Write an enzyme that holds these catalytic residues in place. Structure first.
Site, PDB file in Angstrom:
ATOM      1  N   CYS A 130      25.026 -40.468-102.365  1.00 11.22           N
ATOM      2  CA  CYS A 130      25.518 -41.386-101.446  1.00 11.22           C
ATOM      3  C   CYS A 130      24.712 -42.486-100.893  1.00 11.22           C
ATOM      4  O   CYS A 130      23.884 -42.228-100.002  1.00 11.22           O
ATOM      5  CB  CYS A 130      26.233 -40.576-100.277  1.00 11.22           C
ATOM      6  SG  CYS A 130      26.877 -41.248 -99.188  1.00 11.22           S
ATOM      7  N   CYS A 152      25.170 -43.157 -97.210  1.00  6.38           N
ATOM      8  CA  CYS A 152      24.547 -41.966 -96.488  1.00  6.38           C
ATOM      9  C   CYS A 152      23.088 -42.351 -96.474  1.00  6.38           C
ATOM     10  O   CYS A 152      22.298 -42.432 -95.469  1.00  6.38           O
ATOM     11  CB  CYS A 152      24.795 -40.774 -96.950  1.00  6.38           C
ATOM     12  SG  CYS A 152      26.669 -40.383 -97.265  1.00  6.38           S
ATOM     13  N   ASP A 153      22.395 -42.392 -97.733  1.00  8.79           N
ATOM     14  CA  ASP A 153      21.116 -42.191 -97.889  1.00  8.79           C
ATOM     15  C   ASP A 153      20.113 -43.353 -98.114  1.00  8.79           C
ATOM     16  O   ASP A 153      18.928 -43.563 -97.936  1.00  8.79           O
ATOM     17  CB  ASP A 153      20.759 -41.043 -99.012  1.00  8.79           C
ATOM     18  CG  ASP A 153      21.237 -39.904 -98.515  1.00  8.79           C
ATOM     19  OD1 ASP A 153      20.929 -39.499 -97.348  1.00  8.79           O
ATOM     20  OD2 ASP A 153      21.834 -39.132 -99.283  1.00  8.79           O
TER      21      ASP A 153
HETATM   22  C1  LIG Z   1      24.944 -34.357-101.138  1.00  2.85           C
HETATM   23  C2  LIG Z   1      25.922 -35.139-100.215  1.00  2.85           C
HETATM   24  C3  LIG Z   1      25.576 -35.625 -99.090  1.00  2.85           C
HETATM   25  C4  LIG Z   1      26.572 -36.133 -98.114  1.00  2.85           C
HETATM   26  N1  LIG Z   1      26.234 -36.810 -96.919  1.00  2.85           N
HETATM   27  C5  LIG Z   1      27.342 -37.450 -96.264  1.00  2.85           C
HETATM   28  C6  LIG Z   1      26.801 -38.011 -95.076  1.00  2.85           C
HETATM   29  O1  LIG Z   1      25.966 -38.181 -94.687  1.00  2.85           O
HETATM   30  N2  LIG Z   1      27.861 -38.699 -94.480  1.00  2.85           N
HETATM   31  C7  LIG Z   1      29.140 -38.711 -94.672  1.00  2.85           C
HETATM   32  O2  LIG Z   1      30.012 -39.180 -94.232  1.00  2.85           O
HETATM   33  N3  LIG Z   1      29.682 -37.838 -95.811  1.00  2.85           N
HETATM   34  C8  LIG Z   1      28.609 -37.544 -96.786  1.00  2.85           C
HETATM   35  N4  LIG Z   1      28.759 -36.733 -97.768  1.00  2.85           N
HETATM   36  C9  LIG Z   1      30.576 -36.889 -98.256  1.00  2.85           C
HETATM   37  C10 LIG Z   1      31.273 -35.756 -97.347  1.00  2.85           C
HETATM   38  O3  LIG Z   1      30.472 -34.559 -97.487  1.00  2.85           O
HETATM   39  C11 LIG Z   1      32.541 -35.553 -98.264  1.00  2.85           C
HETATM   40  O4  LIG Z   1      33.194 -37.088 -98.182  1.00  2.85           O
HETATM   41  C12 LIG Z   1      33.374 -34.718 -97.344  1.00  2.85           C
HETATM   42  O5  LIG Z   1      32.674 -33.322 -97.064  1.00  2.85           O
HETATM   43  C13 LIG Z   1      34.663 -34.285 -98.027  1.00  2.85           C
HETATM   44  O6  LIG Z   1      35.365 -33.252 -97.264  1.00  2.85           O
HETATM   45  P1  LIG Z   1      36.485 -32.451 -97.938  1.00  2.85           P
HETATM   46  O7  LIG Z   1      36.825 -31.544 -96.987  1.00  2.85           O
HETATM   47  O8  LIG Z   1      37.620 -33.147 -98.651  1.00  2.85           O
HETATM   48  O9  LIG Z   1      35.938 -31.640 -99.379  1.00  2.85           O
HETATM   49  P2  LIG Z   1      34.506 -30.719 -99.586  1.00  2.85           P
HETATM   50  O10 LIG Z   1      33.409 -31.411 -98.648  1.00  2.85           O
HETATM   51  O11 LIG Z   1      34.326 -30.999-100.837  1.00  2.85           O
HETATM   52  O12 LIG Z   1      34.833 -29.312 -98.874  1.00  2.85           O
HETATM   53  C14 LIG Z   1      35.852 -28.292 -99.871  1.00  2.85           C
HETATM   54  C15 LIG Z   1      35.310 -27.224 -99.380  1.00  2.85           C
HETATM   55  O13 LIG Z   1      36.541 -26.300-100.073  1.00  2.85           O
HETATM   56  C16 LIG Z   1      36.030 -25.106-100.806  1.00  2.85           C
HETATM   57  N5  LIG Z   1      37.232 -24.912-101.689  1.00  2.85           N
HETATM   58  C17 LIG Z   1      37.349 -25.541-102.761  1.00  2.85           C
HETATM   59  N6  LIG Z   1      38.367 -25.141-103.780  1.00  2.85           N
HETATM   60  C18 LIG Z   1      38.597 -23.806-103.213  1.00  2.85           C
HETATM   61  C19 LIG Z   1      39.420 -22.707-103.463  1.00  2.85           C
HETATM   62  N7  LIG Z   1      40.378 -22.839-104.486  1.00  2.85           N
HETATM   63  N8  LIG Z   1      39.399 -21.658-102.562  1.00  2.85           N
HETATM   64  C20 LIG Z   1      38.498 -21.743-101.667  1.00  2.85           C
HETATM   65  N9  LIG Z   1      37.708 -22.664-101.032  1.00  2.85           N
HETATM   66  C21 LIG Z   1      37.859 -23.685-101.865  1.00  2.85           C
HETATM   67  C22 LIG Z   1      34.943 -26.014-101.550  1.00  2.85           C
HETATM   68  O14 LIG Z   1      33.990 -24.870-102.272  1.00  2.85           O
HETATM   69  C23 LIG Z   1      34.161 -26.620-100.353  1.00  2.85           C
HETATM   70  O15 LIG Z   1      33.410 -25.846 -99.738  1.00  2.85           O
HETATM   71  C24 LIG Z   1      27.981 -36.282 -98.799  1.00  2.85           C
HETATM   72  C25 LIG Z   1      28.434 -35.605 -99.980  1.00  2.85           C
HETATM   73  C26 LIG Z   1      27.042 -34.886-100.587  1.00  2.85           C
HETATM   74  C27 LIG Z   1      27.596 -34.306-102.061  1.00  2.85           C
END
Ligand SMILES: Cc1cc2nc3c(=O)[nH]c(=O)nc-3n(C[C@H](O)[C@H](O)[C@H](O)COP(=O)(O)OP(=O)(O)OC[C@H]3O[C@@H](n4cnc5c(N)ncnc54)[C@H](O)[C@@H]3O)c2cc1C
Ligand SMILES: Cc1cc2nc3c(=O)[nH]c(=O)nc-3n(C[C@H](O)[C@H](O)[C@H](O)COP(=O)(O)OP(=O)(O)OC[C@H]3O[C@@H](n4cnc5c(N)ncnc54)[C@H](O)[C@@H]3O)c2cc1C
Ligand SMILES: Nc1ccc(Nc2ccc3c(N)nsc3c2)cc1
Ligand SMILES: Nc1ccc(Nc2ccc3c(N)nsc3c2)cc1
Ligand SMILES: [Cl-]
Ligand SMILES: [Cl-]
Ligand SMILES: [Cl-]
Ligand SMILES: [Cl-]
Ligand SMILES: [Mg+2]
Ligand SMILES: [Mg+2]
Ligand SMILES: [Mg+2]
Ligand SMILES: [Mg+2]
Lengths: 305, 305
Positions: free
Chosen positions: A132, A135-136
């Site tokens: 990202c 972010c970083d």
């Molecule tokens: C290394 C890294 C650093 C980041 N740093 C930042 C930052 O500093 N600032 C920022 O704004 N964004 C950051 N992001 C991005 C941000 O984290 C994501 O955009 C955001 O978390 C997306 O959220 P989401 O809820 O849609 O999905 P996700 O965060 O991917 O969460 C989905 C969750 O649901 C679970 N899940 C999936 N399928 C199933 C299933 N079938 N049954 C049960 N559970 C399930 C997954 O295992 C996961 O735990 C970063 C991303 C990464 C990878």
């Protein structure tokens, strides 16, 4: 026992949906996954999530969200949903050998960032390895870094990063680029960017933090080492839509499609939020915002039944 | 001196846009207004903003956001923008007798909730007077409350509130209802709702907290008092689009229109976020999410120039 709503996923979208649904007295049943807490549960610092003047770690932020959902009565289960039946008035999720049912389902499974799959990538995540630039990139001022990938994502990440980094080496395992001509041409024009085609990373070196990458020419097999202090992986994302393919309409890249500016999917009673849907912003604050919207959509839809 | 971006407004949308733009090294110039900090600066408790397991007051949350924007280099001015020129490569904002210019402008002026305009309304805000059933309905369990308004908003707020309140008295100053037939019919069917048409509130009584409302029949002038402990004002919102009317396309209710699922307005280089745009969710977390998106849109648009 048919619940009002089941939420699948435990990133910011899922926990914000859970907070709103629970506060709305819908008693949401939330399947978090065994790898719970979303993408932030595996970063160090979250500095751009509004509300924390001095920042907060990814795990600290997700634990706040989780405890907040619990406080209002969300029923949280650290289990993966293995299969769903989403058509019709009563939806079913299957979790191992257990089944659960609900009138509405909020899909919040996120998107998986593609990994290089090489030694050092996990160990050095948050210690020089990033996914990202938004972010970083901040943290690599005047440093020599790499960006890996061949699409608009990598071109965007690399050119953005030049406002911080001393140099950016863009590494791609082919000699052809799937990125658009405009994005490709912007990267070529930037004097801080060097292109390394037909090249893969075989290992990321670093004692506490990234110190270099080992490289292999994908054609000739020639190997070498580059001294760098950051590695930005920008080789694409896979939305976690496998559970729902064939039931909910997806776009050609697998993201769940939604109606207009709402969270409504093609299926009645099914709503989608977060990076499962959004292939544009992909931030924690935007995923949290959409998780709120999914719960408000679901609540209003439930009230119409 | 033409800045990269100017942001107009200091609620969650504006401060989140400022955080992202500043972290992107765009040195955003932010006009907060003299009544800065957005709608939360005048509530007590914010319990549904994800990231605070035990809640946070509205002012505490906005001060975190403001200091966060400052930390990354946002230039914040507690002044109102009085006029704008948004067409063309260089946009101008006028602030009293001072002018400022920028290549991109992010509109984050929010929406004003309509007020009853009666004594006690301000004094008892956050102490029994609420604008937001989603937010505050929680706190009126088993209580007798009023909802004021005649549109879908009031019908939605009143029927939602019956899952907490012992009774809901829906007060409207006419005998005709601008709400849709479905929303009207749902409210009529709910046994906890009593309708009081041709009625206005003239005063809200309460020593520390709301104890009653004084009522006037708008036809006969008959006055009376109702004992209640909550007053939910749901008489509509006015998006703060006056600055931009005639320059940016608005919908028939005055909300700024945006393209698809982005923050792009009808004007090149002009982006819009928050409750200035959203007439559906109207939450702090959704406004913050859209402020992030506006800044990412603006950053990418600036990179194309
Ligand atoms: C290394 C890294 C650093 C980041 N740093 C930042 C930052 O500093 N600032 C920022 O704004 N964004 C950051 N992001 C991005 C941000 O984290 C994501 O955009 C955001 O978390 C997306 O959220 P989401 O809820 O849609 O999905 P996700 O965060 O991917 O969460 C989905 C969750 O649901 C679970 N899940 C999936 N399928 C199933 C299933 N079938 N049954 C049960 N559970 C399930 C997954 O295992 C996961 O735990 C970063 C991303 C990464 C990878
Ligand atoms: C009493 C109350 C309680 C609430 N409680 C909650 C809650 O608990 N949870 C929740 O999620 N939501 C809550 N909300 C709703 C939430 O605050 C709003 O949805 C959100 O703040 C919208 O943010 P916004 O940035 O779009 O606009 P706003 O919050 O309205 O912020 C806009 C800001 O920009 C300023 N501005 C406007 N025009 C100009 C100009 N021309 N020049 C300079 N500055 C200008 C305004 O004065 C204001 O300070 C509440 C709202 C109210 C009224
Ligand atoms: N799912 C998925 C699909 C494609 C990829 N591509 C890839 C993998 C490893 C490396 C590497 N070490 N250097 S370039 C590269 C590119 C990765 C994961
Ligand atoms: N801008 C704006 C437009 C319309 C209104 N309507 C209104 C005002 C006061 C009261 C009251 N005391 N009882 S019912 C009511 C309704 C208020 C503000
Ligand atoms: Cl299909
Ligand atoms: Cl199938
Ligand atoms: Cl116009
Ligand atoms: Cl004009
Ligand atoms: Mg999974
Ligand atoms: Mg994860
Ligand atoms: Mg104003
Ligand atoms: Mg305000």
């Amino acid at each position: 026992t048919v619940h009002d709503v089941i939420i699948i996923g435990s990133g910011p979208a899922g926990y914000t949906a859970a907070i709103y649904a629970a506060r709305a007295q819908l008693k949401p049943l939330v399947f978090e996954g065994t790898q719970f807490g979303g993408a932030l549960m595996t970063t160090t610092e979250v500095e751009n999530y509004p509300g924390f003047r001095e920042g907060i770690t990814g795990p600290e932020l997700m634990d706040q969200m989780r405890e907040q959902a619990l406080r209002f009565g969300a029923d949280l289960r650290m289990e993966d949903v293995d299969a769903v039946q989403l058509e019709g008035p009563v939806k079913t999720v299957v979790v191992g050998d257990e089944t659960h049912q609900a009138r509405a389902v909020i899909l919040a499974m996120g998107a998986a960032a593609r990994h290089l799959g090489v030694p050092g990538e996990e160990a050095l995540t948050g210690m020089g390895v990033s996914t990202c630039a938004t972010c970083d990139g901040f943290f690599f001022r005047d440093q020599d870094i790499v960006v890996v990938g061949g699409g608009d994502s990598a071109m965007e990440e690399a050119t953005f990063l030049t406002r911080f980094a001393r140099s950016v080496t863009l590494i791609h395992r082919r000699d052809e680029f799937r990125a658009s001509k405009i994005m490709l041409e912007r990267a070529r024009a930037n004097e801080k960017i060097t292109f390394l085609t037909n090249t893969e990373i075989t290992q990321i070196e670093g004692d506490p933090k990234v110190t270099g990458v080992r490289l292999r020419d994908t054609v000739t097999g020639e190997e070498s080492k580059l001294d760098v202090t950051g590695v930005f992986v920008a080789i694409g994302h896979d939305p976690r839509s496998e559970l729902v393919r064939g039931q909910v309409e997806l776009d050609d890249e697998g993201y769940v499609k939604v109606q207009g500016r709402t969270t409504y999917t093609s299926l009645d009673g099914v709503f989608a939020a977060g990076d499962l849907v959004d292939h544009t912003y992909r931030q924690a604050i935007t995923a949290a915002g959409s998780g709120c919207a999914a719960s408000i959509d679901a609540e209003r839809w439930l009230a119409e039944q």
